[PDB]
Write a protein that binds this ligand. Structure first.
Ligand SMILES: *[C@@H]1O[C@H](CO)[C@@H](O[C@@H]2O[C@H](CO)[C@@H](O[C@@H]3O[C@H](CO)[C@@H](O)[C@H](O[C@H]4O[C@H](CO)[C@@H](O)[C@H](O)[C@@H]4O[C@@H]4O[C@H](CO)[C@@H](O)[C@H](O)[C@@H]4O)[C@@H]3O)[C@H](O)[C@H]2NC(C)=O)[C@H](O)[C@H]1NC(C)=O
Ligand SMILES: *[C@@H]1O[C@H](CO)[C@@H](O[C@@H]2O[C@H](CO)[C@@H](O[C@@H]3O[C@H](CO[C@H]4O[C@H](CO)[C@@H](O)[C@H](O)[C@@H]4O)[C@@H](O)[C@H](O[C@@H]4O[C@H](CO)[C@@H](O)[C@H](O)[C@@H]4O)[C@@H]3O)[C@H](O)[C@H]2NC(C)=O)[C@H](O)[C@H]1NC(C)=O
Lengths: 668, 669
C-alpha cells in the first residue's frame, strides 16, 4: 500500500549490513558476520579509523575502565550512562568512512550493553551524512519490551518455553494463533488496573506504538546533549523547534481528551500531591517499573533536594520575565526579539546550545531530567549503573504516563507567558493583497479502528541452533486508531499571479463547556495539518489537496521482514527514508463519534518568498523564513483574522464500526 | 542425616498419587492417568460418594455458573474466590474415602484454576483424617514464583527459551551453573539490589523461604474461614492460639531487629501516612505486585470507606475494654476471666468460631482482610476475578512486607491491653515445693550462612515432548540461608522429693536500645519459646541435658519432592515433613549473631507435670498441659512476686561465623 523509492545495488549492500545489527538484539550469534568482524577488530591499533583523535582516546580511557555491563537497563537520563553513550556516539560519528563505522558497530554490538548500543547506533545512522538516506526499523521492533504490555510479553515467553502451542484451541481462547508458521498474539490496551482513573479513557492514544515511536524519533533526530551546528542556519531556531514540537503534541492530545469528555490538562505543584497515578506493565528483568499512586505527594524527604532545584529553575525564568532584559549564559537577552524565542526553548531544555558548547557537560543539571525523576516515583538508584526504571526514564515509554503531558503543559505555558512579550501580527503582515478564499469543502472525515502487526521477536530468546537462522515470527496484533483518506478543496479568487503558501490547521470549536472558543484563547490549540506551495492563477481556481499528501504525516513503518523483501526488489519505503520523524497518518484525527464531533479547519494562504536552501533536521522545518506555527506562533488579536485570505470551517469528525478497541480482540 | 520413618506399599501408592498433583502444576500431561480420570469424571453421578449431599449440590450449582478461569491469580481474601475455594474444599473433605478424594482432585486439577486447586488440595490433605501421616512438599517447591525475585525468575526463563546456555562461562558470571542435568541459579536477597529503607537490613529473614513457607502452613492447618470443631479441645482455645502464634512470631522478628540495630516495630495511624514502603521484586504471569512508596497516605479517597470500617472495628474493642463485662456476639464475656482470650483472639481474626458457624460468610467483614487491602496499596480490583496483587494477598508472601509486622504488632498490642485485666500469678502458683535450679550452662551459640537449594521447576513451562519423557525437574535455586551450630543446655536441679516435672526453655533480649536491662514488667511479651519437655526428678541433685536439635518447637528442612520419590522406593518418608509440617525451621531458631557476641537471655522454668487433666493433641502436639500457652509468660508479671527458686535467668551471647553478608556467597570467582 506504500510509497516506494528505487534504490541502487551499493545501497542495498549497505542497508542490509545496517539492519543486521538489529537482529536478535539481546543475544549473540557466534556464527554471524558481525561477530567475526567484532573479534577481528583491534580497537587498540586503529586510531586512524577516526576523524577526531580526542574522541578516540576519550573512548579508550573509558573503555579501559569499563562500561555499563550487558543486560542492565540503559537510560540517557543518568549521568555516567549518558557520558558513555556520548563517547560511543562520538566514535560512530567520527568514523572516517562506512567501513570503519560498520566495524566499530560490530565491535560495540558484541562487547557492550545492548540498550546503550541501540541508542548510540540509532542516532549515528541518523546523524552521519553518509548514512543520512538509509532506513531504520521502527522503535517497536528494536525495543519491543517498551511497547508490549506485560500480559502479552508473558504469553510469548511461555509459548517459546513450550516450543509452540500444546493445543490450538486453548491457545485460541488466549488470543494466540498460528499464521504462515508465525505466532500472532492479540493485545488489548491496558485497563483501569494500569491507569486507575479517567486517563484510561485515552489509553488507545497514549499507549499507541506510533505515538511512542514518534517521540523516540524526535529525540534521536536532535538529542538535547548535542550541539546543533551540524544543521548550520537551523541552530538559531532550536528553541523554536522545541516549543513547536510540544505545543503541537499537547494540542493533538487535548483534542483526544475533548472527544472522550475529559477537559483541560490538570496543572500541578511540586509542593502538593499529584492527582493522577500511573501503574506501568513493564519490568527490567530486575526491577518492575516504579508505580505512582493516585494523590502521590511529590514533596517527600527523598525529593526535598530535587524540588529545590526545580523550584529555582522555574523562578529564575519568572525573574527573566519580570526584568524584560538581562544577561544570561554569556548573552544579553531582550525578550522583544527572536534571538529570544530560541533562547527560551534552549533554557527550558538545558540543551547543549544553551551553553554554546558541543556536548552537555557532567555537571550542567537538567530541569527536564529532574522533573522526570521526581514525577516518575522511583526509589533512588542503587548505584551508577543500576536505577529503578519508570516510564519517564525512556523516550519510548514517556508518552504513556499522564504526568508526561502535565510536565510539558507546564513548560509550554511558561513559554506562552514569554510570548506575551512578542508583538502581535498586524493587518498588513497577514493580508494578501489581491487574494481571497471564497470557499472550503471537505470530504467526510471518519476515524475507525483496525488491526496492526509488528514483530516482537526481539524480546524472545533463541537457542544456539535457532540463532544460526536469525529468527523472528513472534507477531503482536493490536487495534489502532486510523482514518479514511479525505480531500480538502479550496476556492480562491485572485487578482494577479504568484506562488502561494497554503497552510491548514485543526482546532477545537468548543471547550468542555459547549462554548465557542475565541482565538485569543485558542491559538495554542491548533495543530498544523499541512504546508505546500502553489502557483496561483488570475481569477477563480480550485486547490484540491488529499490527506494522504499532507506534509506532516507519514505512512506506517514496514516491519524488517517486509523491508528485506522490498530491498530484494530494489525498493525502500519513502516515509521510513524521507520522513521517519513525522507523526503517523492514522493518528491524524482524534477519535470521533457516530454523531460527528465538531472541530474547525483553519485554511491560510499567504505569499511565497523563495528562501533557504538547507539540510533539515526535521520535516517540520519547511523552506520558509516564517516562524513554525505561523500565523499561530504567538498571541492573536482576533480582529485581524478576518482577512479574505483566511477561512475557518466547521468540520465534524465521525467514527465507524466499534467505538471501543477491546471488542476487536474477543475470541469466538 | 534426615529423620526417616518406614511405610508399606499401600502408603507409597497413595503418597505417589498425592504427590503427582504437585508436578508441572501449571500444565496438563494429557497422557497421565490423572488426565483420563479427570476428563470424564461425572460429579452428579457420584453423589453417593460424598458424606454431604448438599455440599455436592452447592458445588455443582457453583460450577454451572462458572468458576475462576485458568491462569488468573487466586487469593483467598476476595469474596467470590474464597467461596469457590471453600466450595471445592467441602467436595474434597466429604469424599467417602481415598478413591473418591483422588478422582475428585484429578477433575479439579484438569478443570479448575491452579492456585485455587492447589490451595484447596493442600488444606484437604492436612484436614482429611485418612491423610494424617501423609507428606506434602514444601510450599516453595509448589509456588516457586512466590519465593523468588524477578531477577532469578528471568534468568530461569531465559535459560528455558534458549534451551540451555549459549556460553557456559558467561552464564557462570550470572550465577548460572550446570551440575548433572540440573540448572543451578544463585540468588541474592533483594537488598543486594534495593536499599530503600533500613528494613532492608532484615531481608535474609523476611525473604527467608522457610519463614514464609511457615506462615502458609500455619494458615493451612486452620483457615480463619473454617470452624475448628474437628479439633475438639482446641475450640475453646482458638483465640489463644491466634494470639500466641503472632506474639511468638513478633518476638522472633523483633530479635532480628535488635541484632541489626533497628529497635521497636513502629506504630501507625489509619489517618496518617506510613513511613516505610515496600517495593516487591516479584512477578505475576499476568501483572506486577503493588508498591507502597515511603510516606504512603493511608487515608486517600479510595480508602475512606475501608478506613471507617477499620476504625470502628478497633473502637468497638476499646469499648469492650472500657466496659469490662458485656454481651457481644450472643455471648456474655468477662474480661477478668482469663478464658475470655478465646473471644479476644477470635474477634481479631474474625474467624468462624466468633460466630459459632462452620464457614465465615461474605457479610462478616474481616478486619485483617481490610487492613491487608488498605496497607497493600493496590488500586481497586477490576472485577471479581481480577485484582492487583500485593505481598499481603498471599500467605506465601506476607512476611516480606514490613507493614505485615506492623499490622499484627498492632493487633497483638490491643490484646496485651486486655491482658491487663488478668491477675498476675502469685508466688504460690509458680513455686515448685522443694525444687531449685542451681546452675544453667550453655554451649557456644553461633550463627552462620550456608547455601540451600530447592526445586523451582514449577515456575517453568515445558514442551509437549519434555512433558512426555518427564524431564520436568531440572531447575534449582541456590540461596544462602541462616543457620546455627547445635548446642547443649545443662540444667542442674536440686529436689528433695522425687516427681515428674515440666522443663521449659525461653529466649529473650537482655537490653533495650539504651542498653538498660529488660525488666519483666515491661518485657514479658518479647520472650520466644525454644523448648517444652518432661523429666523424672529424684531426691538429691540432677543434671538435665538437652540438645538444640531435640527442641520440640522446631523442624528440619523439607526434602525436595524428587528425593521423596527416591525414598518412597525404599519405603521411607522424612519424619519432619509428616507430623512436624508446621513448626518453624530449626536453622532460623536463633537471630543472626554479631561477631563480638550479641547479648540475650535464656529463661528456664521447671514446674510439676501433675497429671494431664487436659492436653493438646488435636491440631498441635503442643500444650500437654492445663497451662495457658506461653505459661508462665502469658500475662503481665510482677518482678517481685515472680522469681522463685525454680526459675533461672542466664545471660547468653549469640555469635556469628564466616561471612556476615549473604551476598558474599553469590559472588562469582
Ligand atoms: C549478588 O550480589 C552481589 C553484590 O551485589 C553481587 O556481587 C558482585 O558480583 C560482580 C560480578 O558479577 C562483581 O563485579 C566484578 O568485580 C570483579 C572484581 O573487581 C571484576 O573483575 C569484574 O569486572 C569484569 O566485568 C566487567 C563488566 O561486567 C568488565 O567491565 C571488566 O572488564 C571485567 O572483565 C574482566 O576484566 C578484564 C578487563 O581488562 C577482561 O579482559 C577479562 O576478560 C575479565 O572478564 C566485575 O566487575 C562485583 O564486584 C560484586 N559486588 C561486590 C560488592 O562484591 C553478586 O554477583 C550477586 N549474585 C547473583 C548470583 O546475582
Ligand atoms: C481483550 O478484552 C476483551 C474485553 O475485556 C476480552 O473479551 C472478553 O473475553 C472473555 C473470554 O476471552 C469473554 O467471556 C468469554 O465470554 C463468553 C461470552 O459469554 C456471554 O454469554 C453468557 C451467557 O451464555 C453471559 O453470561 C456473558 O455475560 C456473555 O455475554 C463465554 O462464552 C465464556 O464462558 C466461559 O469460558 C471460560 C473459559 O475460560 C470458563 O472459565 C467459564 O466457565 C465459561 O464457560 C467466557 O466468559 C468476555 O465476555 C469478554 N469481555 C467483554 C467485556 O466482552 C478479550 O478476551 C481480551 N482479548 C485479548 C486477546 O486479550
Amino acid at each position: 500500500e506504500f510509497k516506494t523509492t528505487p534504490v541502487d545495488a551499493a545501497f542495498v549492500e549497505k542497508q542490509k549490513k545496517i539492519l543486521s545489527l538489529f537482529y536478535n538484539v539481546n543475544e549473540i550469534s557466534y556464527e554471524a558476520e558481525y561477530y567475526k568482524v567484532a573479534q577481528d577488530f583491534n580497537i587498540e591499533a586503529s586510531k586512524d579509523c577516526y576523524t577526531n583523535m580526542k574522541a578516540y582516546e576519550n573512548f579508550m580511557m573509558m573503555y579501559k575502565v569499563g562500561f555499563l555491563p550487558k543486560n542492565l537497563e540503559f537510560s540517557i537520563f543518568y549521568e555516567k550512562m549518558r557520558e558513555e553513550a556520548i563517547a560511543l556516539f562520538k566514535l560512530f560519528y567520527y568514523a572516517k568512512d562506512f567501513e570503519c563505522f560498520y566495524k566499530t558497530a560490530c565491535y560495540a554490538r558484541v562487547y557492550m550493553n545492548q540498550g546503550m548500543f541501540l541508542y548510540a547506533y540509532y542516532i549515528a545512522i541518523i546523524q552521519r551524512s553518509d548514512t543520512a538516506s538509509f532506513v531504520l526499523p521502527a522503535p517497536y521492533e528494536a525495543y519491543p519490551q517498551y511497547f508490549v504490555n506485560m500480559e502479552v510479553k508473558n504469553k510469548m515467553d511461555y509459548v517459546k518455553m513450550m516450543d509452540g502451542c500444546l493445543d490450538e484451541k486453548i491457545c485460541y481462547n488466549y488470543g494466540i494463533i498460528k499464521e504462515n508458521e508465525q505466532f500472532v498474539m492479540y493485545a488489548n490496551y491496558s485497563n483501569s488496573l494500569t491507569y486507575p482513573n479517567n486517563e484510561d479513557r485515552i489509553a488507545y492514544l497514549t499507549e499507541d506504538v506510533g505515538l511512542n515511536a514518534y517521540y523516540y524519533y524526535f529525540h534521536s533526530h536532535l538529542p538535547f546533549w548535542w550541539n546543533s551546528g551540524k544543521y548550520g542556519a537551523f541552530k538559531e531556531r532550536r528553541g523554536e523547534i522545541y516549543f513547536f514540537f510540544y505545543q503541537q503534541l499537547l494540542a493533538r492530545y487535548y483534542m483526544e481528551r475533548l472527544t472522550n469528555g475529559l477537559g483541560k490538562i490538570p496543572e500541578f505543584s511540586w509542593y502538593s500531591p499529584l492527582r493522577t497515578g500511573y501503574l506501568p506493565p513493564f519490568n527490567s528483568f530486575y526491577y518492575p517499573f516504579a508505580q505512582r499512586s493516585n494523590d502521590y505527594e511529590l514533596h517527600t524527604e527523598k525529593n526535598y533536594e530535587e524540588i529545590r532545584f526545580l523550584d529555582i529553575y522555574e523562578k529564575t525564568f519568572f525573574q527573566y520575565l519580570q526584568q524584560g532584559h538581562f544577561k544570561a549564559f554569556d548573552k544579553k537577552i531582550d525578550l522583544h526579539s527572536s534571538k529570544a524565542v530560541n533562547f527560551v526553548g534552549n533554557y527550558w531544555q538545558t540543551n547543549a546550545d544553551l551553553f554554546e558548547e558541543d556536548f552537555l557537560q557532567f555537571y550542567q543539571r537538567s530541569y527536564e531530567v529532574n522533573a522526570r525523576r521526581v514525577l516518575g516515583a522511583a526509589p533512588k538508584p542503587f548505584n551508577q549503573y543500576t536505577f529503578i526504571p519508570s516510564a519517564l526514564d525512556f523516550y519510548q515509554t514517556s508518552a504513556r504516563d499522564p504526568a508526561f503531558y502535565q510536565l510539558y503543559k507546564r513548560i509550554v505555558q511558561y513559554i506562552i507567558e514569554f510570548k506575551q512579550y512578542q508583538v502581535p501580527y498586524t493587518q498588513e503582515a497577514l493580508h494578501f493583497v489581491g487574494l481571497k478564499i471564497s470557499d472550503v469543502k471537505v470530504d467526510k472525515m471518519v476515524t475507525f479502528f483496525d488491526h496492526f502487526d509488528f514483530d516482537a521477536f526481539n524480546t524472545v530468546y533463541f537457542s544456539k541452533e535457532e540463532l544460526k537462522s536469525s529468527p523472528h515470527g513472534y507477531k503482536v496484533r493490536q487495534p489502532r486508531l486510523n482514518h479514511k483518506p479525505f480531500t480538502v478543496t479550496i476556492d480562491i479568487k485572485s487578482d494577479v499571479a504568484t506562488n502561494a503558501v497554503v497552510k491548514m490547521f485543526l482546532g477545537p470549536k468548543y471547550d468542555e463547556n459547549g462554548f465557542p472558543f475565541s482565538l485569543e484563547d485558542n491559538w495554542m490549540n491548533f495543530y498544523e495539518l499541512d504546508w505546500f506551495v502553489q502557483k496561483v492563477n488570475p481569477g477563480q481556481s480550485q486547490i484540491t489537496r488529499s490527506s494522504t499528501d499532507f506534509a506532516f504525516f507519514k505512512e506506517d513503518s514496514l516491519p524488517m521482514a517486509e523491508i528485506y523483501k522490498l530491498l530484494d526488489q530494489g525498493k525502500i519505503p519513502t516515509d521510513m527514508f524521507n520522513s521517519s520523524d513525522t507523526m503517523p497518518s492514522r493518528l491524524m484525527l482524534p477519535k470521533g463519534t457516530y454523531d460527528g464531533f465538531p472541530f474547525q479547519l483553519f485554511v491560510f494562504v499567504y505569499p511565497y518568498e523563495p528562501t533557504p536552501k538547507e539540510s533539515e533536521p526535521f520535516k517540520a522545518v519547511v523552506p520558509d523564513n516564517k516562524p513554525f506555527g505561523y500565523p499561530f506562533d504567538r498571541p492573536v488579536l482576533p480582529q485581524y483574522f478576518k482577512q479574505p485570505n483566511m477561512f475557518f470551517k466547521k468540520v465534524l469528525v465521525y467514527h465507524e464500526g466499534e467505538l471501543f478497541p477491546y471488542l476487536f480482540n474477543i475470541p469466538h | 542425616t534426615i529423620k526417616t520413618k518406614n511405610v508399606d506399599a499401600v502408603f507409597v501408592e497413595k503418597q505417589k498419587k498425592i504427590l503427582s498433583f504437585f508436578q508441572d502444576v501449571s500444565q496438563l500431561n494429557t497422557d497421565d492417568e490423572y488426565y483420563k480420570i479427570g476428563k470424564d469424571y461425572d460429579i452428579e453421578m457420584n453423589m453417593d460418594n460424598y458424606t454431604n449431599k448438599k455440599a455436592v449440590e452447592e458445588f455443582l450449582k457453583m460450577y454451572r455458573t462458572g468458576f475462576m478461569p485458568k491462569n488468573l491469580e487466586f487469593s483467598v481474601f476476595y469474596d467470590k474466590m474464597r467461596d469457590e475455594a471453600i466450595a471445592l474444599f467441602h467436595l474434597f473433605y466429604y469424599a467417602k474415602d481415598f478413591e473418591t478424594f483422588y478422582k475428585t482432585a484429578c477433575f479439579a486439577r484438569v478443570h479448575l484454576n491452579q492456585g485455587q486447586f492447589l490451595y484447596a488440595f493442600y488444606i484437604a490433605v492436612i484436614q482429611r483424617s485418612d491423610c494424617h501421616g501423609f507428606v506434602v512438599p514444601a510450599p516453595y517447591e509448589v509456588y516457586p514464583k512466590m519465593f523468588m525475585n524477578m531477577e532469578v525468575l528471568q534468568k530461569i526463563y531465559v535459560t528455558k527459551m534458549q534451551d540451555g546456555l549459549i556460553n557456559p562461562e558467561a552464564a557462570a558470571k550470572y550465577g548460572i551453573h550446570k551440575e548433572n542435568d540440573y540448572f543451578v541459579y544463585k540468588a541474592n536477597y533483594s537488598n543486594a539490589v534495593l536499599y530503600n529503607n533500613e528494613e532492608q537490613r532484615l531481608t535474609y529473614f523476611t525473604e527467608d523461604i522457610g519463614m514464609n513457607a511457615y506462615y502458609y502452613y500455619f494458615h493451612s492447618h486452620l483457615p480463619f474461614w473454617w470452624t475448628s470443631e474437628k479439633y475438639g479441645a482446641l475450640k475453646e482455645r482458638r483465640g489463644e492460639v491466634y494470639f500466641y502464634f503472632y506474639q511468638q512470631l513478633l518476638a522472633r522478628y523483633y530479635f532480628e531487629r535488635l541484632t541489626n540495630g533497628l529497635g521497636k516495630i513502629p506504630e501507625f495511624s489509619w489517618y496518617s501516612p506510613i513511613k516505610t514502603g515496600y517495593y516487591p521484586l516479584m512477578l505475576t504471569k499476568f501483572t506486577p505486585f503493588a508498591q507502597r512508596p515511603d510516606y504512603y497516605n493511608l487515608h486517600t479517597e479510595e480508602n475512606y470507606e475501608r478506613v471507617r470500617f477499620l476504625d470502628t472495628y478497633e473502637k468497638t474493642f476499646v469499648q469492650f475494654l472500657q466496659k469490662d463485662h458485656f454481651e457481644a456476639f450472643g455471648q456474655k464475656i468477662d474480661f477478668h476471666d482469663p478464658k475470655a482470650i478465646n473471644f479476644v483472639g477470635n474477634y481479631w481474626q474474625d474467624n468462624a468460631d466468633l460466630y459459632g458457624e462452620e464457614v465465615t460468610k461474605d457479610y462478616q467483614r474481616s478486619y485483617e482482610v481490610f487492613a491487608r487491602r488498605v496497607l497493600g496499596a493496590a488500586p481497586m480490583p477490576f472485577d471479581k476475578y481480577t485484582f492487583m496483587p500485593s505481598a499481603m494477598d498471599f500467605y506465601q508472601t506476607s512476611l516480606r512486607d514490613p507493614a505485615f509486622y506492623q499490622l499484627y504488632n498492632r493487633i497483638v498490642e490491643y490484646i496485651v491491653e486486655f491482658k491487663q485485666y488478668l491477675k498476675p500469678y502469685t508466688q504460690d502458683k509458680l513455686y515448685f515445693d522443694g525444687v531449685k535450679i542451681t546452675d544453667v550452662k550453655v554451649d557456644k551459640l553461633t550463627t552462620f550462612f550456608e547455601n540451600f537449594e530447592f526445586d523451582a521447576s514449577n515456575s517453568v513451562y515445558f514442551s509437549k515432548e519434555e512433558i512426555k519423557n518427564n524431564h520436568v525437574h531440572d531447575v534449582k535455586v541456590r540461596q544462602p540461608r541462616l543457620n546455627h551450630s547445635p548446642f547443649n543446655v545443662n540444667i542442674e536441679v536440686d529436689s528433695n522429693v522425687a516427681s515428674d516435672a515440666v522443663v521449659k526453655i525461653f529466649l529473650a533480649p537482655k537490653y533495650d536500645d539504651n542498653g538498660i536491662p529488660l525488666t519483666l514488667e515491661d518485657n514479658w511479651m518479647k520472650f520466644f519459646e525454644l523448648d517444652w519437655f518432661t523429666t523424672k526428678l529424684t531426691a538429691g541433685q540432677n543434671k538435665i541435658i538437652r540438645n538444640s536439635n531435640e527442641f520440640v518447637i522446631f523442624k528440619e528442612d523439607s526434602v525436595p519432592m524428587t528425593e521423596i520419590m527416591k525414598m518412597l522406593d525404599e519405603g521411607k518418608v522424612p519424619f519432619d515433613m509428616s507430623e512436624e509440617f508446621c513448626y518453624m525451621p530449626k536453622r532460623l531458631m536463633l537471630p543472626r549473631g554479631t561477631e563480638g557476641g550479641f547479648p540475650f537471655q535464656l529463661f528456664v522454668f521447671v514446674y510439676p507435670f501433675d497429671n494431664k487433666g487436659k492436653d493438646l493433641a488435636p491440631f498441635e502436639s503442643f500444650v500437654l498441659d492445663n497451662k495457658p500457652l506461653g505459661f508462665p509468660l502469658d500475662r503481665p508479671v510482677v518482678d517481685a512476686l515472680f522469681k522463685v527458686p525454680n526459675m533461672y535467668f542466664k545471660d547468653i551471647f549469640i555469635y556469628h561465623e564466616g561471612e556476615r553478608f549473604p551476598y558474599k556467597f553469590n559472588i562469582p570467582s
